[PDB]
Structures are given as C-alpha cells and as structure tokens.
Symmetry: C2
Subunit: 174 residues, 2 copies
C-alpha cells in the first residue's frame, strides 16, 4: 500500500529531524529518504535569506560546498512563483510548460521523449516563506503516483522542515 509506505516514510523522517546533526545533514537524509523510499527524484531543499538571496541549498548526496550544484538544477521561474505566492506549483510535463525554459527541462532530465513532472511546495516560518521543497518524477510504466498526494505529503514535510530550520536559525542567532 502506498499509504503504508508513506506512513513509514514520515515515521522515518520524524526520527531524522530529531537526530542532532548539521542542518545540511538532516535535510540531506530527508531528501535521500524521499528518493529511496517514495521514488521522489532530485529532491532539493532550497532555503533563502530574508532578502531572497540563497542561504543554503541541499539535495540528494550533499557534501560540503555542493550547494551550487543543486541550485543549478532549480527552475527559477517556478521557484520564484512558489516563494512569491506561498502556494505549491505543479507541472505535469516540464518540457511543455510555460514556466519552464528549455534549460529548466534539460536540468530536470526532461526531453521530448521523457515526460517529467515537477512538484514544489513552499517552506514557511511564521507566515513568511523562507524557501522551497521540490521534487520531480519520470512518467513511465511506474506506479500511478497522484500529484495531489505528493503535494499533501511534501506540504507536511515542508512544515516540519520549517520548524527544524527555525530551530537552527533561532539557535545560531543567539
């Protein structure tokens, strides 16, 4: 059952967020889990300073100082929309979508032959949007992953990540 696997995934994610470790290590383990467990590929936690300048960017396999490698994979128009609107964004086919340039689709693995869907949700801290959590899926003869379920699940993960981020920011700032 997809719900059984998703219940185990959020159970494991809850453990990860409570384990004391460097924020980037926590966020890395989370998106690693979204991929290996729920087949959500290229999961990226993008965090921004208050002036919209990148703070940290971490995706699957993050090592120290690799932030740019993951930021070079984000479709900035779509991410800008999510940040500016505080509403999730979905594209069934990023190769044929207004908010995705030719470069956006290439970076996300999309071609004229391979249909790639994008799903991004906002990360919020006290009504302010501080970043994005985004994934993509390749539409082949995989399971029938409903985009609305992904949006719900990622919105839940984003909420918890925002608390983890506020925790780290409150700590460092004192």
């Amino acid at each position: 059952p997809l719900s059984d696997i998703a219940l185990t995934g959020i159970f494991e994610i809850s453990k990860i967020l409570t384990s004391p470790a460097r924020l980037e290590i926590t966020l890395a383990n989370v998106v690693n889990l979204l991929q290996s467990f729920l087949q959500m590929r290229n999961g990226v936690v993008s965090l921004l300073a208050d002036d919209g300048v990148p703070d940290i960017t971490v995706g699957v396999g993050w090592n120290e100082g690799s932030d740019n490698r993951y930021r070079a994979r984000l479709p900035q128009k779509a991410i800008d929309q999510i940040v500016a609107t505080a509403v999730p964004l979905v594209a069934d086919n990023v190769s044929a979508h207004p908010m995705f340039t030719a470069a956006d689709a290439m970076a996300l693995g999309a071609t004229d032959e391979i249909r790639v869907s994008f799903i991004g949700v906002p990360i919020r801290i006290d009504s302010r949007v501080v970043g994005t959590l985004s994934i993509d899926r390749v539409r082949d003869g995989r399971s029938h992953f409903r985009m609305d379920a992904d949006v719900r699940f990622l919105t839940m993960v984003a909420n918890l990540i925002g608390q983890t981020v506020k925790l780290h920011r409150v700590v460092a700032r004192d």
Copy 2:
C-alpha cells in the same frame, strides 16, 4: 483504511505543531485531534524541567491552569520508567502491570470489571527524554500488529513534539 486515516492525522498534526501559538495551546490541539480523529483517547503531554520538575502538563480539553489535574491521572512510576529507559511502555492491563499500583490503576478508571490499557512514549530532545506522551482506554483485543502500529504512531508524534518543545525553550 488504517494508514490513510493516520496519514491525514499526522498531516494535520504537522500543521498544528508549526502554527504560532502558546505551547500549551499547541499540545492541547494535538491530543484533541488524537482523540477526536484517531480514537487515541485521554492523551496527555507531560514535560519535565531539567531538575525533573513537572513544569507543564496538558491533556485533552486543557484550560488555563488545569495542569495538575492531568498529572494526577499519570502513573508516576511508569513515567519514571519511560524517562530513564527512552522506550515505550505498553501496559495492556494496568491492574496487572507491575509498574502500576492499585491506586495508579484506579486513577485511570480501572475497576474489578472495567480494565484499562496504557501506552506511554518518550519525548526526546538532544538524546534526552524531557517528557512523555501517553494515551489510555478501556482494554480491547487489538492485534499485536496494530498495537505496534499505534506505538509507532505516538513515537512519531512525540518526536515532533520534542522538536516543537525545544524551539519554545530557546
């Protein structure tokens, strides 16, 4: 269908935990949801200060100042066990569980006819148990499978509560 309901519950719990509010208001909304939505009844959050102080106790239907009434319901020895052990305590039958006095069992509603199950779970912050999350009910014949699933669910909720509590304390 079991996991769908739980998924919705943890989804809603996540929004409650991340909505700005009084700490006590947050914890009361969580246990209110656990009871009304997931039928995990009589939920109590008890947080210890570093000297072991009770410091905050909030259960279903909490009103300002009512902490001591919820703590009166909790079997302190079992709480002592969970804190030192960082492991769930499942008291399938509190009248026969060795960590429960007769007074502890009766306070949970146990009688010579009625019987009561108790499940307690550690709330950890930085490898240290700062409190417990517990539920209780009239005993039923749940499968060991769903008993474990309920324990897994409350462990998850307690993990997230700990993150919320640490945030409030800093």
